[PDB]
Design a protein around this ligand. Structure first.
Ligand SMILES: [Cl-]
Ligand SMILES: [Cl-]
Length: 162
């Protein structure tokens, strides 16, 4: 298992514009297009992102390309973030995947706000961090996915994904 396969399990793949769990226009592998309610504003962002007139539909290859950029940007955002970087550097390979997953879903600012859990992860207090991570809107809103990420942090194994 690796970060790509992990995220592919959590986000799915859709080749036509769809609405995410929050109700926002998305396409491919969890690629957020816009927070705007307008489907046209979404199609516009979509075409800008792909470099062609898509009419709301893309191919698998195009979906995968967006995905590659998005994972890349997630990692680089962590590395540039003063709050996140030290956490990431402290972690083993599996748990690093878990932090990347959170960042991809909720953005850098979002994760960076989990101050207390971050400190606990850094200190390697697994069980405590798992308990604190669960007290969040994130966990309340997407409990199945959150549990999977949380289990990855607690255990340092890919069990939740197998
Ligand atoms: Cl883009
Ligand atoms: Cl869920």
């Amino acid at each position: 298992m690796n970060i790509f396969e992990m995220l592919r399990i959590d986000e799915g793949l859709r080749l036509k514009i769809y609405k995410d769990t929050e109700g926002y226009y998305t396409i491919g592998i969890g690629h957020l297009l816009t927070k705007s309610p307008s489907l046209n504003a979404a199609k516009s962002e979509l075409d800008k992102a792909i470099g062609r007139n898509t009419n709301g539909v893309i191919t698998k290859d195009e979906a995968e390309k967006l995905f590659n950029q998005d994972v890349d940007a997630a990692v680089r955002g962590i590395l540039r973030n003063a709050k996140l970087k030290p956490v990431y550097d402290s972690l083993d390979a599996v748990r690093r995947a878990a932090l990347i997953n959170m960042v991809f879903q909720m953005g850098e600012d979002g994760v960076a706000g989990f101050t207390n859990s971050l400190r606990m992860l850094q200190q390697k207090r697994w069980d405590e961090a798992a308990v604190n991570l669960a007290k969040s809107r994130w966990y309340n809103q997407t409990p199945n996915r959150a549990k999977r990420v949380i289990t990855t942090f607690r255990t340092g194994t890919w069990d939740a994904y197998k």
